[PDB]
Design a protein around this ligand. Structure first.
Ligand SMILES: *[C@@H]1O[C@H](CO)[C@@H](O[C@@H]2O[C@H](CO)[C@@H](O)[C@H](O)[C@H]2NC(C)=O)[C@H](O)[C@H]1NC(C)=O
Ligand SMILES: *[C@@H]1O[C@H](CO)[C@@H](O[C@@H]2O[C@H](CO)[C@@H](O)[C@H](O)[C@H]2NC(C)=O)[C@H](O)[C@H]1NC(C)=O
Ligand SMILES: *[C@@H]1O[C@H](CO)[C@@H](O[C@@H]2O[C@H](CO)[C@@H](O)[C@H](O)[C@H]2NC(C)=O)[C@H](O)[C@H]1NC(C)=O
Ligand SMILES: *[C@@H]1O[C@H](CO)[C@@H](O[C@@H]2O[C@H](CO)[C@@H](O)[C@H](O)[C@H]2NC(C)=O)[C@H](O)[C@H]1NC(C)=O
Ligand SMILES: *[C@@H]1O[C@H](CO)[C@@H](O[C@@H]2O[C@H](CO)[C@@H](O)[C@H](O)[C@H]2NC(C)=O)[C@H](O)[C@H]1NC(C)=O
Ligand SMILES: *[C@@H]1O[C@H](CO)[C@@H](O)[C@H](O)[C@H]1NC(C)=O
Ligand SMILES: *[C@@H]1O[C@H](CO)[C@@H](O)[C@H](O)[C@H]1NC(C)=O
Ligand SMILES: *[C@@H]1O[C@H](CO)[C@@H](O)[C@H](O)[C@H]1NC(C)=O
Ligand SMILES: *[C@@H]1O[C@H](CO)[C@@H](O)[C@H](O)[C@H]1NC(C)=O
Ligand SMILES: *[C@@H]1O[C@H](CO)[C@@H](O)[C@H](O)[C@H]1NC(C)=O
Ligand SMILES: *[C@@H]1O[C@H](CO)[C@@H](O)[C@H](O)[C@H]1NC(C)=O
Ligand SMILES: *[C@@H]1O[C@H](CO)[C@@H](O)[C@H](O)[C@H]1NC(C)=O
Ligand SMILES: *[C@@H]1O[C@H](CO)[C@@H](O)[C@H](O)[C@H]1NC(C)=O
Ligand SMILES: *[C@@H]1O[C@H](CO)[C@@H](O)[C@H](O)[C@H]1NC(C)=O
Ligand SMILES: *[C@@H]1O[C@H](CO)[C@@H](O)[C@H](O)[C@H]1NC(C)=O
Lengths: 120, 207, 207, 120, 207, 120, 207, 207, 120, 120
């Protein structure tokens, strides 16, 4: 019963803060690198953040580095995206992908979440 | 089914060229032990020893772990040569024209990722033959095994006692024994150890 | 055409690494039987027996079933080595330098998924040669076959009587017979059986 | 004459229930894993539900698990999708794909149905 | 160019595993004939005959037809082993360790789809050696060829007379002849014929 | 000079009949499986009908089986699509694809036609 | 860099199965010449000649041309076996068990597309041994080379004189010479020539 | 992990066919040196020398550089044969039937891109045997190594002294020595040098 | 400095004539098969005409054969598309692709031009 | 921390000049070929300029050659695009891609930048 449930989305003003949280179930969370993708309404998916399976490597998109912070908690099987100073182009459905022992940037993902809409 | 799912998932992000370690700064422990089946030939003109040997290499693939509950009925998995990482343990003093007499069988991995590799082979090894006690000579033929390209701190080669339970006696040579010894050799450039396992078969000429 | 459609469809979702069983918790039954063609050599210095043998392995691929009505004219299919799963049945006491003298032919599958595999080979097997009744000696050379990596509860190896209908008599050895026996061997760690089939060729020296 | 005929679609209100049924013909139904895909009007196809060829494994999308229930009947060669508490984003053409002995999630499908439109 | 277009188009929808027949319910006719080049060895202890033979198999690929007008200058095409379907004609009574001494050359196809295959080989065949008229013995060594997995109604094997125009005389054996015979053998389960071609080389000991 | 010319399109009312005909030239017509694809204006191409190279196998889409009938005439190098009881969703440009010795459903096509617009 | 660009571009649209000719209705000229290194064995029981030979085949690939100005520093390119078209020139009267003793080296192509191929080999060729002037016999062993599947008008095989500059004298046979001759042979069905090059090594027994 | 990232990144844009040089107009320096392990056979009838040799080729791949800080714990990398460029250094005067007795091991590359290649082999080389001081003869057997297709200005072959630290003494021949010499040979068409390294093993017959 | 410059586009009435010309530079023109593709505004690229590297084979789309004529001049490194009796659907940006020794229909192209807009 | 930061975009009139500059970090700049891609709002990405890893080879699109000039500075890890005489179709988000030891035209890129919008 592999499931990736995202939460914490909604409406924010510019220069705000939001803590997106995704809970994983049905698979070994510590064995998978967990990354955040975004889908803007009429564009294509793009990488936002990614953390390695060991949690020792975090990779952020150039458009978001310094503002977004990806983290993981293996005890609660959770992936956190702490976003600070959001901006109008940070408006999309954010959803989480999981890759088996992935590095965190270029990986073949196995499980995909539903996603939460955030609007700026 | 669950076996199909597991086989599809295990190779999602897998590079056979990469050492299967969680942390790249610590070595992977590979346990090595041979099984002597029979001594086929002791060539005296060309200083070569021909023996039947089943190698046994056991290591841990951190990338081949799975949940038995999530994959009911599938507690083991087989991977052919070239699809998963295998230690490059070779016989250094081998006199075979191909230099690698091992038959590459499938590697067996269980739920914890423990990989077992059992290559059979007819090994031709370089052994100095001393003939001066000819009717009562005891000869020590060394079978030196080691990683061709990995050293210490990357591939920690550990030794297990060889078993002669399947040994077939020879009509000319009596197997006094086959003790193994693990040695470490050092370069001048670095303090990097290089482990190796030498099994010294001791044979007596039968009169 | 229908053969093209069937060949395209049969490999839609097929992993050669996976055991072709509907349920992963029960074994696949593999029927094994050899056909002796001729005894080519009985080496006495190197305790090796050289024989011509056609293996026969029959199993059931649950994934290679099709409707003859939906595929008129196509009641059989051939798959080369490496494209479908095959049992890893090897000669354990083989003294061949390659350890696998079988010539990998195509596997034949019919509409119910029944797979037939007939590897010919010139098998060199380890056989203890007893020479103390030299002019009237009877020798029992064992040909021990088994799955290299599968045990019981996964690959149930069953035995069928060997046939000597194509046997070519030898000028030095008389084939007293070749009875087969299925044995099960057990580890200490688990109660998992490990089956094997030993065909014990009985030969008499011709005077 | 391989055919996958879907039926049971139509107009429903939010928090309703619908039983979609797909009948298969022309191929061995018991040998194929049967999955449900959806196509929203101006988006891409996405997995909704899937049942293995043996019927012992059911996989649901994270957006729909708990609400949708996939089942199969080999005697009638039918795949059922029982949907409870539908929601406005559950508005699409639902169509059934068949994969030869598929696991039920990631498979190469061979036969595709037409589809029934459901609107919430 | 036209050859490039033809080579790209001929493999558009082509499965080498499928028999190249327009209708799957009728056999593909394969014409078989060997060419003896020289008898290299007649082993008497191990009942083995070693000969140089060029096989010749001709069939019709329904999928390799093209228009010479649409492809000017390209009236023939070559396909390596493994890219197009080839008959699995093997020497049944072969005593070679690899069991297949044929060198897989390219298959030549012309505009009508007619495929020619000429594998050279040094064939080691099982031949019972009768030594009781030793100084004047005539021996009949059978070379039995047939499809390994195809039977009748699928692969109709037809025979053509062997040619000895390139024969090199041997210093110990005189080639009395090499007549061929096509035989059909039947299972009990089905009425399906199984054709084979046996070329019986007749040799006389030279005194 | 490989050419696939379609004809017989136009405007029809619902529950009508239309006989689309495609003439082939420049290649051996009897060696190719001939299939009909359709392109609705703002959607993707989809299979409608297909006949094998030997003409002994006809495959229809589930949305159209029973109503459409594909046939071939090797003497005139022609592919016919006889459509009965057309329906508003049967409105698209219909064009013919040719596959070398194809089965008629899943094949690598070599030659494509122009297409005729039919509207219901 | 420029070498990377050239290697990527040269294989844009390239089929190794296609003859590299601008016009398909005219032959590709292949220049053939061998280099004798040493005569290793002259087998008299089995009429076989064993020699060390370096073949040299030169042709023109119309598809492997490039501008040196557009690719500075890259005036040559190497292609392994199987990636570009190579002539199927084989030794017709070869008695080797593999029938092809050539070691497939890389093909060297320069800016004009000229391809050079230098396969070394230990060639075992069928040679009738005449022993009736035994102490003073001169033997003419023919090495017959030709395209296996291409004939005239497609592969025009031309001859170049063999060089013995690297010849190593033998302790039993004196190399009188090795002249080459180009011959054309014709089928009855067509007027299509079939060229071949025969190098007739002339040896004298050393007394 | 970092090793996975490095292995994925190192083959982003990599062509094994291309010489790993930053500038295509200057040669890549390849350092060559052999290690003699034992002289196995000195064949006098067939002028062939059989020896155990470990080759050592060191060069610099400009494309296999990485940052140790960016890839912690990964200071070395292994590439199998066929995935990265390797020098085509072969034994010119080799009498082996395969002409290449080297066992293709993995190439080891460190952070600066320095590639090490250590092929073991049982080399059969052509050596003129002079037997006229038979009981006290000293023989100079030349082992000539060079690039098969690269010349100077592309592959600058440099020599390093051979080491005999692992030499196993022979029971018939005493190793007087093995000095190496680098030579350059020139075509008439161009001023392009062609380097080669000849190791002349000097042996004395043991009395 | 590989460059493919197209010229000769513009506005034409129906049943007119236009001679599009593309000049090539930076590569051996005689070694490349030169083809014409078109891009209509809101559709996908499609093949219009193609000439082999030797110039002995011309392939036209079924929608355009008889009206368009592709030619090449190796002396001036030019590809010509002579269009007669243009039609409203012949309105697009026409651009030239080059394939190394290509046949002229199905090839892997190496160099692409900019394109000229023609409107009918 | 691989990052490609583009700067220098904005609003320009036709026949103007703009110097786009992209700074690279987190990877060996001298080991990567650096190219400029553009994304017009409702079209696909396309190559504009590219410089080899050694900086000895510059490749420009046919639509832009003569007007745009790509350059690189390895000391400052910077890629410069000097644009002269811009034109209305030179309106897009310009972003930089990096390929490991790439030639500069056809390469597998590893790192992508964010991009700067320029409007004419
Ligand atoms: C899988 O195999 C491993 C290794 O055989 C088992 O784990 C233990 O491994 C150590 C050495 O690594 C052995 O000394 C122990 O005897 C093993 N424990 C056993 C055999 O109980 C492991 O138990 C096996 N099974 C699973 C599910 O992981
Ligand atoms: C396909 O092959 C199988 C196996 O030969 C046939 O099924 C039976 O299989 C059992 C053993 O598994 C044999 O003992 C029987 O003799 C077989 N029945 C026969 C030969 O009639 C099966 O009949 C074959 N044909 C089809 C269409 O499935
Ligand atoms: C292509 O090859 C075939 C076979 O060689 C030729 O067709 C005839 O084939 C039969 C046997 O199948 C032979 O007995 C005839 O002699 C062949 N006719 C000939 C050689 O004229 C066919 O002619 C060849 N050429 C073409 C263009 O198809
Ligand atoms: C490339 O190689 C060819 C062939 O060696 C050179 O062209 C001439 O080829 C003929 C035979 O085809 C030789 O007889 C000539 O001697 C060759 N001319 C020479 C060697 O100058 C060609 O010159 C070589 N170089 C280039 C740039 O094409
Ligand atoms: C990587 O390997 C190279 C080569 O062994 C080391 O660089 C020097 O290389 C020259 C010859 O190219 C040797 O003579 C030196 O002894 C090498 N320096 C050493 C060994 O310190 C290099 O140091 C190695 N390590 C790294 C990180 O590049
Ligand atoms: C790996 O090992 C090193 C040294 O032993 C240690 O510093 C580090 O924290 C470990 N874990 C990593 C790199 O994730
Ligand atoms: C996966 O394994 C963990 C512990 O190894 C166990 O608690 C969990 O129940 C397993 N998954 C399932 C679905 O049972
Ligand atoms: C498979 O076998 C197990 C045990 O024999 C049984 O419990 C199960 O119901 C079977 N079927 C499955 C897992 O689909
Ligand atoms: C498929 O097989 C079933 C039973 O095996 C049979 O009833 C059915 O008719 C077959 N399909 C067709 C199209 O005949
Ligand atoms: C194939 O042969 C069968 C039997 O001879 C015949 O009934 C059928 O019409 C033929 N053609 C097909 C199956 O297309
Ligand atoms: C194709 O072949 C047919 C008959 O075999 C012939 O009439 C036709 O002219 C050929 N095609 C061309 C383009 O000439
Ligand atoms: C090819 O050769 C033929 C005959 O020699 C000639 O008619 C033709 O014009 C040449 N060129 C081609 C086909 O492009
Ligand atoms: C390409 O070659 C031609 C003649 O071979 C030459 O004129 C031209 O300058 C070359 N290209 C370049 C870029 O120099
Ligand atoms: C490469 O070497 C040549 C000649 O040594 C030199 O002219 C050139 O500047 C070097 N660098 C390149 C081509 O990038
Ligand atoms: C990369 O290497 C350079 C010099 O080799 C060093 O200054 C830099 O710190 C390294 N990268 C990282 C992330 O440390």
């Amino acid at each position: 019963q592999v499931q990736l449930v995202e939460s914490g989305g909604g409406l924010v003003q510019a220069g705000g803060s939001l803590k997106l949280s995704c809970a994983a179930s049905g698979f070994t969370f510590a064995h998978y690198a967990m990354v955040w993708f975004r889908q803007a309404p009429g564009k294509e998916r793009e990488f936002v953040a990614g953390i390695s399976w060991s949690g020792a490597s975090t990779y952020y998109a150039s458009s978001v580095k310094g503002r977004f912070t990806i983290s993981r908690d293996n005890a609660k099987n959770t992936v956190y995206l702490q976003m600070n100073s959001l901006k109008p182009e940070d408006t999309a459905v954010y959803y989480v992908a999981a890759a088996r022992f992935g590095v965190g940037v270029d990986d073949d993902y196995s499980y995909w979440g539903q996603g939460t809409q955030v609007t700026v | 089914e669950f076996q199909r799912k597991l086989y599809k998932e295990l190779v999602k992000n897998y590079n056979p060229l990469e050492r299967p370690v969680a942390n790249d700064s610590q070595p992977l422990t590979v346990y090595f032990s041979l099984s002597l089946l029979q001594i086929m030939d002791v060539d005296e003109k060309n200083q070569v020893l021909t023996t039947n040997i089943w190698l046994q290499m056991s290591w841990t693939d951190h990338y081949l772990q799975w949940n038995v509950s999530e994959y009911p009925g599938v507690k083991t998995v087989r991977f052919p040569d070239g699809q998963i990482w295998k230690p490059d343990i070779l016989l250094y003093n081998s006199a075979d024209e191909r230099f690698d007499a091992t038959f590459h069988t499938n590697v067996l991995v269980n739920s914890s990722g423990h990989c077992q590799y059992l290559p059979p082979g007819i090994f031709k090894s370089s052994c100095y033959i001393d003939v001066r006690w000819f009717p009562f000579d005891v000869q020590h033929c060394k079978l030196k095994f080691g990683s061709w390209s990995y050293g210490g701190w990357s591939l920690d080669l550990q030794m297990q006692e060889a078993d002669i339970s399947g040994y077939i006696p020879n009509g000319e040579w009596d197997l006094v024994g086959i003790p193994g010894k693990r040695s470490e050799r050092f370069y001048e450039c670095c303090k990097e150890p290089y482990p190796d396992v030498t099994f010294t078969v001791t044979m007596r000429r039968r009169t």
